[PDB]
Design a protein around this nucleic acid. Structure first.
Ligand SMILES: [K+]
Ligand SMILES: [Mg+2]
Ligand SMILES: [Mg+2]
Ligand SMILES: [Mg+2]
Ligand SMILES: [Mg+2]
Ligand code: NA
Ligand code: NA
Ligand code: NA
Lengths: 71, 54, 135, 142, 140, 130, 183, 102, 70
RNA sequence: AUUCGGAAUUCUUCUCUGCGGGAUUCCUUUGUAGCACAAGGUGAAAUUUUGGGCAACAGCAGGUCUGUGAUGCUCCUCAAUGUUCUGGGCGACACGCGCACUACAAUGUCAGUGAGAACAAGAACUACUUGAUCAAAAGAGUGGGGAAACCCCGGAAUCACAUAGACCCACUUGGGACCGAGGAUUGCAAUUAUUGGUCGCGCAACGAGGAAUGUCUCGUAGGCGCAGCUCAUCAAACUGUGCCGAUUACGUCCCU
């Protein structure tokens, strides 16, 4: 696709806060991590969630990200 | 018929958008703005036997 | 076929009171007669012993008399009855082949006979209408 | 010993299965017919491309038998040239080095991608209210 | 050194075999062959003076490739598209009349025999004849 | 008799439905009972919605249409809760029914749609760690 | 033991070049064996500038309902066409063909932006040179005794020389003259 | 001895796979040689018809499809052994036919 | 328009003395120079090839292109 | 060495399919001023991957009371607007209009020869082989075989042919409308032709079509045949399937 929806972006942000020390900048390891820590009936959706989660992690390595509170 | 080289595509003029506005560099270094019919892109080469910018 | 023009080449030939072009191949020059088609004109060429690769207009009168005799009555030469146009004529019962001016005159008799007895095909023919159930 | 490999290739519906073997004299046949009896001469030049591109010295002692089913006149000439080209690569992988195989594989790709990779295009279904995949019924107003 | 069928041009085998049948002068030709259309899907007569010999050589080669084939099977091979006038065209199989006569002529020559419970297949003599002719065309 | 089954070869048993507030087949027949009696249409439709929502449903909808008042037909719907309407999975998370009730004049047709609470196609939950 | 391909196993692709600098990058001279290939040439915007020039000619002969989809027949028509070009010119048939598409389309055109004289993109000169020559031959052989290989050969040979007896050169002279007036 | 062929056919995909997976486990308990199962091609039944009941507006159609699933297992055991393998409560929609191979 | 269907004395010797001096020879080209049908023009060219007075160049079922022998 | 059609072993490259894997703007760079875009890479597939299905809230005095044992209110009701039987009509016309089929030819017509699909359906009617055949075709008639096992190695038509075949620019071997005389088949019943096959007529327009106008962006347009449905008999229609396979644009708000 081109543009991600609210369902993807909201869910992909809970993943970052709960599991921040199991993620890195690689899409393929992140997807394997995500499929074990979430429930959903469509593999297409889980692919996009891991796609955006990788994008967030790169931004966090640079500076703070709005709406993400690691605490 | 001197030759010219297209260095930038200004925009798509015309009512129906079938004519392009380009700036050519006379390879025969002067930049002249001309109208072009047909599909064209940068670094092309016309065979010139100005125009108002869009 | 690199054969020179004969001095007797006939650009127009006469057969069964019909003009026939003297430039076509023999089977396709006899189709110009009424009652002789493409399929029938090849059989006439075989029975007369004429090569089908010649131009009509090179053949002589003896060939033309044999041609006009096969067409007149195709029975003595073994041409089967399922090959003739008028079989079991309704008013005489005799099988025959109609050609030249006899094709038209007997068609006139068929229409006049249907109209005389007031049949449905007769009245439709008289009024200049369609007779085979075309809307 | 036997030195046998089997490959395949498809174009639209044609499936061509090859069988490359080590023999004494070069021999390529398609569905039984030898290579020089294939017609038209245009479609025979497409199949021979799977040989001229690399050179015939690499087919020096190989015997290839191709059996094609499905498709049509031109689909089967394209499926058969894939199986022959993929067959040479598969035989070199199983009985030669990687340096020799890699040189062959790039030459095939530098000429035509579809000498080793299948074309994925297939017929588009027909939809109601249309005469074809994309042509609608004629419209009239008055 | 030797050669078999399928190693030679399909036509050049048929053209050579048809010459063999005509020159030997032993095959049996029906009388209806001089006045007949090869099928009811055709428009005119075959127009080749030796058209029965060409089919018998073509029928014999067909039986060689597909043993057990019958008259209905061969008619599929010799079909065509019919001109229906102002209506769309369709496919019509050939008539099995002339195919019945072609298998009779070859059977009397000893080249073809009835098959095992179905169809027609060529005998050992027909196998020698077919392959011997294929070597003759190959050496030109 | 209809199917010519031989004697001793056919048997029927009757089992009871678990909860009557989640079957639109039974609910529509309760609604028709009120309608064939002297009952207000709004008071009739409010009973069904409140009952099924109280019984544990996830989304409900009642539609009554056709010559309700006057000589002109009209449609009256009553919605409550959440209800999906598109896709293929809507044939498993929604139950529906219909009936034709014979009034003194004309006809009345009523439908009831109940959303039965596999997860939803587009819901994602993240497991709490530790 | 590879060897460079030759068109129809006879005509050489070595030394092929265009004398028109503008069109050099839009005519493709990559060697091939036959004018037939199955590639997705209409997937990107500038992919038809790489398809070989002789194959583009064979695609222009498949016009009208009679000619739609007959690509093997179009290759055979071109096989005889190049033979006649060799006898008429005594030159390489492939050098004559690329000399024709470089002289068959107008360098200046007039359009309805305001009409106004407008220059023509190099991709349009190549496309229009093929279209005008294929059309000029197809209409000159409709109810004629000549066959189409002889009509097409006369079109290409005349266009390469700039002769006015070509259909494409007639249209190019008219269009260029009209556009100059609208300048 | 003899070979018995079992044919499983039903309109539901899950029901077919549940019964066949049961028979294999029961067969292996009796220590019986097995040939299969084989997944035969599934036939698709199609009916297409117009939506309108009066013939008005645009001509719109809908297509209704049905699928049929089929499996076969060949055993090697006499009748009594087979009479014990398949004696269970299969769910509705699935049928099993016993055939003795030649 | 009006094309002859058989050779005469004057056309035949022209076919055997002038056609062999043409760079490009085709059934259609010889037809309009001698005013004969393309059916008998094709037969005359097949005769000249058989005696080896012109050279075949491109042969097909429906197309034939000849030229000078040298 | 190469071909063709008894006994054996083994084995899943191709075929079959229930649940899985795979693609995510993933990677690099540009324009850059967070959301994103363009070109390229990886790759079977690179942008909603492709094609469909389902689709909110409101409305139309849109269609249907010829579907229904869904109905309000009406009408007729015993030589009846109920029901059955016989005959006719819905098919009538040198008039007008919408949508199709066939053509106006040589990139062709005719006569041969070659190689070669997919989706389907079948009484449980579909179809093979052999007679007929010491002589047209269509037909008749005998034995057998069935649902990935029979039909079936599914012998489709475009297509190809170095086929040393015919025709040669003309309303002509283009086109096949209209009509005549035999004969067979479906049916209780072919006279308004039920349909098919043989010979004849072809002297019926038609040589590319005024003003206007429809659909279409890649296995697509166009061309070519094949199944299903209606069906005792009849497809120039519709619903699907495969075969050959392009030109142009990848833009704009001029018309709608
Ligand atoms: K026709
Ligand atoms: Mg319409
Ligand atoms: Mg047609
Ligand atoms: Mg053709
Ligand atoms: Mg209808
Ligand atoms: Na036709
Ligand atoms: Na109304
Ligand atoms: Na419009």
């Amino acid at each position: 696709g081109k543009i991600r929806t609210k369902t993807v972006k909201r869910a992909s942000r809970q993943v970052v806060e709960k599991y921040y020390s199991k993620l890195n900048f690689d899409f393929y390891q992140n997807k394997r991590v995500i499929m074990d820590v979430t429930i959903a009936e469509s593999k297409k959706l889980k692919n996009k969630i891991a796609g955006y989660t990788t994008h967030i992690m790169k931004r966090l390595a640079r500076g703070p990200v709005r709406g993400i509170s690691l605490k | 018929a001197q030759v010219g080289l297209i260095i930038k595509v200004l925009g798509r003029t015309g009512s129906r958008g079938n004519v392009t506005q380009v700036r050519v560099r006379l390879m025969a270094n002067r930049t002249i703005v001309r109208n072009v019919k047909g599909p064209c892109k940068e670094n092309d080469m016309l065979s010139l036997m100005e125009a108002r910018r869009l | 076929s690199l054969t020179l023009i004969p001095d007797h080449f006939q650009h127009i030939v006469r057969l069964l009171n019909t003009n026939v072009e003297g430039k076509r191949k023999v089977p396709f020059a006899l189709r110009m007669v009424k009652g002789v088609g493409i399929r029938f004109a090849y059989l006439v060429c075989k029975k007369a012993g004429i090569d089908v690769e010649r131009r009509a207009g090179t053949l002589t009168a003896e060939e033309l008399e044999k041609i006009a005799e096969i067409i007149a009555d195709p029975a003595k030469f073994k041409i089967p009855d399922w090959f003739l146009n008028r079989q079991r004529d309704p008013k005489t019962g005799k099988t025959e082949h109609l050609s030249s001016s006899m094709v038209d005159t007997r068609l006139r008799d068929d229409l006049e006979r249907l109209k005389k007895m007031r049949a449905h095909r007769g009245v439709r023919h008289a009024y200049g209408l369609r007779v085979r159930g075309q809307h | 010993a036997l030195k046998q490999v089997q490959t395949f290739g498809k174009k639209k519906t044609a499936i061509a299965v090859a069988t490359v073997t080590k023999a004494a004299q070069c021999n390529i046949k398609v569905n039984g017919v030898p290579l020089q009896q294939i017609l038209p001469d245009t479609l025979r030049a497409k199949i021979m491309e799977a040989i001229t591109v690399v050179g015939s010295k690499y087919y020096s002692r190989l015997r290839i038998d191709v059996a094609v089913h499905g498709g049509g006149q031109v689909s089967q000439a394209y499926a058969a040239r894939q199986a022959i080209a993929k067959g040479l690569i598969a035989f070199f992988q199983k009985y030669h080095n990687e340096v020799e195989k890699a040189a062959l594989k790039d030459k095939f790709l530098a000429y035509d991608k579809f000498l080793l990779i299948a074309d994925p295009r297939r017929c588009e279904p027909k939809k109601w209210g249309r005469h074809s995949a994309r042509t609608r019924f004629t419209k009239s107003y008055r | 050194k030797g050669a078999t069928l399928k190693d030679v041009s399909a036509w050049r085998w048929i053209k050579t075999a048809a010459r063999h049948f005509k020159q030997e002068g032993k095959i049996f030709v029906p009388n209806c062959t001089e006045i007949m259309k090869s099928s009811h899907g055709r428009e005119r007569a075959p127009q080749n003076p030796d058209w029965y010999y060409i089919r018998c050589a073509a029928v014999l080669r067909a039986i060689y490739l597909r043993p057990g084939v019958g008259y209905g099977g061969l008619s599929k091979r010799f079909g065509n598209k019919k001109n229906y006038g102002s209506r769309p065209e369709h496919t019509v199989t050939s008539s099995t009349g002339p195919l019945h006569w072609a298998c009779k002529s070859l059977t009397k020559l000893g080249l073809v025999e009835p098959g095992a419970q179905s169809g027609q297949r060529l005998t050992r003599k027909g196998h020698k004849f077919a392959d011997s002719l294929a070597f003759q065309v190959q050496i030109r | 008799q209809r199917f010519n089954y031989k004697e001793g070869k056919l048997q029927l048993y009757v089992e009871r439905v678990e909860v009557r507030g989640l079957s639109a087949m039974a609910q529509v027949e309760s609604l028709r009972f009120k309608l064939l009696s002297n009952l207000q249409v709004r008071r009739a439709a409010m009973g069904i919605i409140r009952y099924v929502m109280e019984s544990g449903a996830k989304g409900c909808e009642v539609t009554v249409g056709g010559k309700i008042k006057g000589q002109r037909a009209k449609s009256m719907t009553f919605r409550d809760g959440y209800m999906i309407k598109s896709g293929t999975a809507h044939k498993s998370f929604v139950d529906s029914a219909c009936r034709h009730c014979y009034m003194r004049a004309g006809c009345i047709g009523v439908k009831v749609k109940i959303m039965l609470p596999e997860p939803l196609p587009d819901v994602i939950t993240v497991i709490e760690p530790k | 033991s590879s060897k460079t391909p030759k068109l129809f196993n006879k005509w050489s692709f070595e030394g092929l070049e265009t004398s028109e600098l503008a069109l050099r990058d839009h005519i493709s001279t990559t060697a091939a064996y036959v004018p037939h290939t199955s590639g997705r040439w209409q997937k990107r915007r500038f992919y038809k500038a790489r398809m070989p020039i002789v194959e583009r000619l064979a695609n222009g002969l498949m016009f009208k309902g009679r000619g739609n989809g007959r690509k093997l027949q179009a290759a055979r028509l071109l096989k005889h066409t190049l033979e006649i070009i060799h006898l008429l010119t005594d030159e390489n048939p492939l050098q004559v063909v690329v000399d024709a598409v470089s002289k068959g389309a107008p360098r200046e055109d007039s359009t309805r932006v305001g009409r106004q004289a407008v220059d023509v993109s190099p991709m349009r000169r190549v496309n229009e040179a093929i279209y005008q020559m294929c059309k000029g031959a197809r209409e000159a052989a409709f109810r004629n005794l000549k066959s189409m290989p002889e009509c097409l050969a006369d079109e290409i040979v005349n266009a390469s020389k700039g002769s006015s007896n070509s259909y494409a050169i007639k249209k190019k002279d008219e269009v260029e003259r009209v556009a100059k007036a609208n300048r | 001895g003899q070979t018995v062929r079992l044919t499983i056919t039903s309109r539901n995909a899950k029901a077919v796979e549940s019964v066949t997976s049961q028979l294999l486990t029961r067969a292996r308990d009796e220590k019986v040689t097995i040939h299969g199962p084989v997944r035969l091609p599934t036939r698709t039944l199609k009916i297409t018809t117009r939506k309108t009941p009066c013939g008005n507006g645009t001509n719109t159609w809908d297509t209704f499809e049905l699928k049929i699933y089929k499996r076969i297992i060949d055993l090697h055991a006499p009748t009594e052994q087979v009479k014990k393998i398949t004696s269970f409560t299969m769910e509705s929609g699935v049928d099993v036919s016993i055939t003795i191979l030649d | 328009l009006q094309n002859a269907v058989m050779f005469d004395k004057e056309t035949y010797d022209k076919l055997r003395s002038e056609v062999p001096k043409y760079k490009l020879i085709t059934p259609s080209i010889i037809s309009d120079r001698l005013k004969i049908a393309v059916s008998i023009a094709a037969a005359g060219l097949k005769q000249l090839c058989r005696e080896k007075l012109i050279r075949l160049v491109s042969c097909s079922s429906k197309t034939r292109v000849y030229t000078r022998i040298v």
